[PDB]
Structure formats: structure tokens, C-alpha cells
Amino acid sequence: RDIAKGHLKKVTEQYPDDVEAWIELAQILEQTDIQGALSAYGTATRILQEKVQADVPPEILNNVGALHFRLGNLGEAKKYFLASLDRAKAEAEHDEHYYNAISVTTSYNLARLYEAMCEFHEAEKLYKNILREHPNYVDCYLRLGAMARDKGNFYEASDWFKEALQINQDHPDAWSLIGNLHLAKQEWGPGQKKFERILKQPSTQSDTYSMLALGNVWLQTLHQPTRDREKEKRHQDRALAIYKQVLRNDAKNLYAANGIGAVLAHKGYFREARDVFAQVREATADISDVWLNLAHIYVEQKQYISAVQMYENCLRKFYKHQNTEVVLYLARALFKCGKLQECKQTLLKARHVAPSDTVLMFNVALVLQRLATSVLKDEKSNLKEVLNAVKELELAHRYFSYLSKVGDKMRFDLALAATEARQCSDLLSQAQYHVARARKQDEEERELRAKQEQEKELL
Amino acid sequence: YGILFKQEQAHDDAIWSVAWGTNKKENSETVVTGSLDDLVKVWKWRDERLDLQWSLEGHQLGVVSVDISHTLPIAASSSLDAHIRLWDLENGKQIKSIDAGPVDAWTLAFSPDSQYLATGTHVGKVNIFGVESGKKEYSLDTRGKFILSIAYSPDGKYLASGAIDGIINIFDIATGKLLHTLEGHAMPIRSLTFSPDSQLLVTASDDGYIKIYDVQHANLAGTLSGHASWVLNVAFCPDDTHFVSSSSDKSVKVWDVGTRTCVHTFFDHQDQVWGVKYNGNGSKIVSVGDDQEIHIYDCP
Amino acid sequence: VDVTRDIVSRERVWRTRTTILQSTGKNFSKNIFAILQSVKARE
Amino acid sequence: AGILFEDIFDVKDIDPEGKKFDRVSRLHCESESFKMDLILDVNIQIYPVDLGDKFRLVIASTLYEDGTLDDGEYNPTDDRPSRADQFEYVMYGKVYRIEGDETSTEAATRLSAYVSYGGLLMRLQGDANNLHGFEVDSRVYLLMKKLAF
Asked: What end-to-end distance do the CA atoms of chain A give, in Å?
């Protein structure tokens, strides 16, 4: 490609009546910066009208619209695709160049765009129009399942993906999508190894995708209290071997180092996890996983100042606003004033979208208790706050009574709420003691204002 | 089709719901909003301007739902504090506080007759409390996961319920019995409302599709592609010609109830919109959200 | 049918699954495996 | 540690008011994460920079990893580890003004560190949260490295 680029740089300056030179310019720059190819097609579109009045072939408008499809010019790319379809339809005599295939690919990109233009009805219609004329096509039949998969992972998505594999078992994309199906329900933890090892035959080898799927599914087995049984150490070693193997054959793969940092953090090297995660961050930090793995290291070293922002940024994406896992990771060792009262605000924001989780209902009570003990033990503070703390403690006690009746828990029984009840009892006693102090401060301020008013009367 | 009023910093904390009147009983001119700052602000939309009339407090936790009685100028506000407090827009005072304990308190549902108040229950049932009683009159025995949305029909003939897994439960407020169970969604239903004629039922699930079903024969009237994020709030135009849709992507699309086409879209909100509601005539479209800015959208 | 070979032979796939895995830059394992072995030597 | 600030930036405009000198130019750069302004002045002659280039600016109170707080004097004959080994442009200055949007009642929310590297000025304007390590009359470094990306 370097010699071709140099040759294009030579043909660009001079003008020996260049017509297709810019076409070759853009054909290489599609992998590189997407604006160079757009510029080349922009100039190539107008260079085809001086020799004769010949309409632009649909293949160039189609490719420029494809270039714009990745960009924010969704409407402009839509116009390009529609005009390409119009032009390709006019090719009644270009049976050798197969205008039909050109229309098929243009419509494929157009349906991909409509699926991306918040219009899945038109995307379904267009992809079906491709199906009705060419059932031997895979990508349309695979995107249809993706569309049905948004509503749920048990609808026609799970059926179409397997029908697409059954028609082409040598399609790595379809088989990987098959493995992706089992990811919704992780009950297939150990058993997904088999279905992920179907196309691990040497003919398909080497495939980094499936190997990293194995590494992930092997990492998921971690975070268990059975490590002392020499079971999770072996799992760490196996996954580490997988990551080393995918590292030797591919040193530039970021996910291998991502997992290596994950396990090393699991090995207790957080001081040494930042260095490994640094290369992954510097390569491309716009992946949802790194913002959290790094925030874990920051929140581990008593740096919530550098962890809350990382959790906010991952939520800046247009997929949700209140995720449960991010907020769960948000409150780890928060004890400061701006990290308790506000922590309640974010906890309530999270529970608003799905209150059915027990961990939220337990953490809200814990932070309520922390504030109450933080205002009813060593304070001697404002009075209205002593009035509100008893209400907060009563709500916490009601949640203590309610949480005890729930059957299932966070893979750990909550029978240890008794100490919380005793804590709230002695907190009630301390509150009934400190309300008298509140009244004493009230009479103190009253006599202070009186002894100031007398001086003002003197003046 | 544009924006008339722009209330900057309408609240200290994010607004999760908005209530505006439709009748002439001193409700269409006053806007009641509920935010997470424990401020039940009674805004009076007087002189085509959003002016504050009352500032009601008392809720321990942030307001989750606000609605204005259809045949009555009073209002009420619920929260997750299990203390559903009734209010009055005639005096800015509290009528009562239904202690829907211990945690069993969700969005409100004013009856069209303004005599019953439906509230979701964590056990999956729908408790129907009395407005002037406060005691649990009768509970719908349709268990499951949880009630995420409850809506009363304008003329009081049906009642639907949004579950956590896309389960519409068509009840009968005329007899208190489950008639249909529409399960066309697998996503948690955020909110829903009845058509002004009680014939169409829009569902705001977390799939981005506005699947408008029918209530008379419990069938789907058409799948409408909504926004890219989750549709949070949805309301019908009082004259019954269009319906707005609030999503989680700073987009206020006004979809057509007849042609299933977006007739206009607003992008004035910097954050996600949580509440959208019409005026008494359907020209002004009030909106709230995490931006904490009340936008009044005029569509003549 | 010929429609299959008619499209896969003229199209161009600039990005696929594996492309997403490697960084667009040059980050070799010399600065990675070094620490990966140092951590193992201390243990 | 001594890392008083750490963040990636990108160049967006050079000498908007016309290049005054011949070896120094204004770099009206912007951040990528903390969203902070930057008016650094680098020696364009020895260390050329063009628009769109990104670099990892790190204001550090010392050049040693252990952080021994050097007195401040040119002592090239030194075998101790130095953080400058992985930076192509390092400077040494002394912050002289920390302006902010303070009021009579509520604390400031956005500060502005003004540091002078012996003549080369630099304003690190942004929020008042990450500028806690800057105090008037204190020595600091720059430690910037251009990113190949």
C-alpha cells in the first residue's frame, strides 16, 4: 500500500487529464482517515461531468454514502443511498457488472442505516426485501435477529441465529453469535466451553475472538470464597496461560492485557495493576471495561475523588442513565459528608429504575444509619437535624424489619441485620438524649438574642 | 411547533414527573411537579408564564409521581418513603399522609371519578386505596414481580398495569377483575396511559418500540419505532390527534397516533426528559427531566 | 447461486472482529511481558 | 508521588493574535477528560508542534520517583532515577498567581493557575477540584510528551 500511496501522491500534483486517479486515492484511504476518502470522492464526483454528460455510477455514490454512514451525516448518507439505488436501477444493460448486486449492497447499507436511524420497521422491511430475493445471504438474516434481539433474547433472534449457522456452519460470525446467545444467562458457565470449542479446529485457527471468549468465561468463575481450596488459583493460572498464549501470537491485542490486569488485580497487585492497565487505557480508553477496572484501582486506594468521575464518564454513553452496577461500585468506602448524603441521592436514582434489588435497599439503610450515628453520637449540632434524624432512623428500622422477610439475597444471607437493629436501638436512646440538648441550645439562643436586643435598646 | 416558555433551574434536584391539568377546575392553569429535592412546587401557569404558587414539603424521599385530580382541584404526591401524602392546590396544605408501609409505595393513579387511588405493590399486586379514606379498600390479586406503571382510563372503563417484564395486566375497575394479560413486551414497562377515547393503549417499554395495543379486543394495533433510548413518559393530546413520548436520550418526539409518524421533535433538553404532559387543549406540552428545566412546548 | 460470489468478490471489509481486538497503534509485549515475568519472579 | 496534575490535551489553535516572537508561540490547548483550558508557551524552535497533536502534560512538584523535594539547582552529574526520562519537553517554573471565581460567601468552583517558567507563561484554567496541589510561590515542572496515537 505504501508504493500505491506514493504513486497516488505523484499522480495527484500533475494533471494529465486525471479521471480515475482520485478513485484509486479514495480506495486506499478507506482504512485510513475517513475524511481523505470523502474528499477524494467529492472531487471525483465532479470530474466525471466535464468529458461528457454521464451520470455518476452508483458504486461511487454508494461507497461515499457508506463512508458517511459511519459518520454523523446519517441523512446525507441516506440521500446518497437512495440516489445510488435510483442510478443502479437505471442500469438495465449492465448485466456484466451486475447492477443487481450493487442495488443489493446499497439497500443492505440503507437498512443498516435505518436500523441505526431509530427506524427498525423500515430496516426490517428492507432486510426482508433482500431475503425474499436471495435467501443465501447471511448478514441481512443476522441483523434481523439482532433487531428482534433488542426486544428479548428468546424471540426470533435465537432462532434466526441458529438457522443462519445451520445454513453456514463455516461462518465464524454466526457461530460466535451463537456463543453470544449463551451470555445472557450465565447458568451455562462451565458448559459454554463445549459450544465455544466447536470451531477451534486448526482450519479456523488462529481465532483470537473465541480464545478471548474462553478467557472471559474462565475469568467469570472468579470472585468466589473457594480460593483457599486451590481451585481459583488454578483458574487464574489457566486464564493467565490463555492470555499469555494470545499475547505471544498477538502483542497488540488489548483485551489480553485487560484480562491480565484483571487477574493481577485479583492476585492482589493493585499497585501493579495501574501499570498494566495503563497501556490499555493509552491505546483506546473508550471501552466500557477499562473505565471500571481502573476506577476499581482508584476506589481501592482511598481515592473516591478519582473514581466517581470515572463512573460518571462510563454513564455518559447514550444507553442508560442509572445503572445498578456502576452505583454499586460507586459507594465502597465513602464516609465524607459529600459522599454520604449525595450517595443517598445516587442510590435513590438507581433504585428508581428497579427497586426490586435487595442490595440497594440494604445500602440505603446502612448510609442512613451512618448519617444518624454521625449526627446523634458526637453532636451537639443543629436542632432541626436532630428532628430529621429520628425520622430517618425510623425509616431505616422499617427497612430492617422488611429486609428480614425476603427469601433470596445477594448470594449471602442477611441474617446479620441483628447488629443493625441493636445499633439503631442505641441510636434511638442517644437521640432521645440529644433532643434535650437541642432544647438547651434553643434556650441558649433565646437568651442570646434577648441580651443582644437589650444592647440595641441602649443604643 | 416550537418552545414557548423555558424555565431554567426549575428545581434543585432532578425532576422525575410532571402534572398539569386538563379540565377547568383550577388545574390546567397550575403545574404540579415532583422532584428528588423533596420540593412539591405548585407552579401556576398564569399570564402564559410559569409562576410558583405553592412550595409543599414533607416527603422524606424524592417525589416519584405527581398527578392532578380530574374532577377536583386537589393533588397528591407519593414517594418511596411509603408515605403517600395528599395535598390541596386551593390552600397549599396537606390533607393526609397514607403510610403505605413499609416500602410498598409507587406511582399514583388518580381515578377519573376522583374517588380511588391505585398504588403499585412490591408483591406484584395493585393496591387500590381510597382518596378520602386512606385505608386499603381492595387489592388486585395479580401477583408476579412488581407494578411499574398504573393508569386510569379517562372515562373509567379499563385499567392497565406495566410489569418489570413487559406484562400488561388489563383490569376492570367496574368489577375489579383481570380481563386480559397482554404480554407483547419482555422489557420493563416504564409508563403508560389511556387514549382519550379509551380505545388505544400505548406502552413505553425499554426496547424503544411504541407498541400501541388495543383494549377492546386485546390486540396489537401496530409496532411503532420510537427513539434509541428507553421511552420514559408518554401522554396523549387531549383532542386525541397526537401523542408525545419522553425517552432517555434528550429527545422529545411527538409521534402521530394515526399515521405512526414523528410530527416534530425537540432537542432543547441537555439531559434526559423524565416527564411530558399536555395542556387542556393540547397546544402547550410541559416537560421536565434531569436537566431540572421545565420547557413549555407550543404546537398550535 | 451466483448472487453470493457476485457480491463477496467486489465488496471490501475494512474492519472485522479481530481488528477491534488489536490497538490501531503499535503496543508490543516487550513492555507487558516484562512486568508479567517480574511479578512472577517475586512470588 | 508529587503529581499535582495529570491529563491529556490536544492542540486547537496557535498564536490566534499573530505570532509575536520567533521561537515561542501560544498553545490554546484543551483537555479531553477534566475539560480544562491551557495557554502553554513552548519553544517552537527546538520542539515544534502542529494543530491536532495530543500530549500528556503532567505538572509534578519533583522529578524523582521517591519524591525527595530537591532544593533546586543544576546538577547534571546525578545518577538517581528521573521522571524526565520519558518526556521530550520538560520545564521548570514557579506558579505566581492562583485566580478563581471566589465570592464573599461560597468557595470558588473554578481556579486558574498562573505559572511562569522563567518567562514562559501557562494558565491551567478549569474546575477548582484538581488544582488543590497548586499554592502561590512554589516550584513546579511541566513534563509533557507528544503522543504518537
From this structure: 93
| Experiment type | cryo-EM
Provide the greatest CA pair distance for chain B.
47
What span, in angstroms and rounded, lies between the C-alpha atoms of A367 and A34?
50
Return the DSSP state at D106.
S
Report how far residue A173's alpha carbon sits from residue A176's, in angstroms, rounded to the nearest whole number: 5
Sheet architecture: strand order including B191-194: B191-194, B200-204, B209-214, B220-225
C-alpha cell at B242: 397526537
Under 8 Å CB pairs connecting chains A and C tally to 80
Domains delineated in chain D? 5-148 (2.40.50.140)
Cell of B212: 400501541
From the candidates D33, D34, D35, D65, which should be mutated to test the interface with A, based on the most A CB atoms within 10 A?
D33
Phi, psi of B41 (to 5 degrees): -85, 125
Residue type, A382: N
Residues 6+ positions from A454 with CB-CB distance below 8 Å: none
C-alpha cell at D138: 512554589
CA distance B31 to chain A (A): 23
Do A300 and A270 form a contact (C-beta atoms < 8 A)?
A: yes
Residue B57 CA to residue B37 CA, distance in Å, equals: 10
* D contact test, residue of A309, A311, A316, A339 with most D CBs within 10 A: A309
Cβ A58 vs Cβ A88: under 8 Å = yes
Per the document, the length of chain D is 149
Domain boundaries, chain B: 1-300
Q: Which CATH architecture has domain B1-300?
A: 7 Propeller (2.130)
Q: Of B100, B170, B114, nearest to B140 (Cα)?
A: B170
Backbone φ and ψ of A391, nearest 5°: -65, -45
Residue A374 φ then ψ, to 5° = -85, 0
Which backbone phi and psi does B10 adopt, to 5 degrees?
Answer: -65, -15
Task: Single out the residue of B289, B211, B279 nearest to residue B16, CA to CA.
Answer: B289
Residues constituting chain A: 459
Q: Is the peptide bond before D138 cis (omega within 30 degrees of 0)?
A: no
D59 Cα distance to chain centroid: 5
Bridge partners, B295 (sequence order): B6, B287
Residue C23 and residue A254: Cβ atoms within 8 Å?
A: yes
Task: Report in angstroms the alpha-carbon separations of A2 from A7, A313, D56.
Answer: 9, 39, 30
Q: What are phi and psi of A438, to 5 degrees?
A: -55, -45
Separation CA B220–CA B166 (nearest Å): 14
Distance CA A458, CA A448 (A): 16
Task: Report the C-alpha gap between B160 and B149 in whole angstroms.
Answer: 8
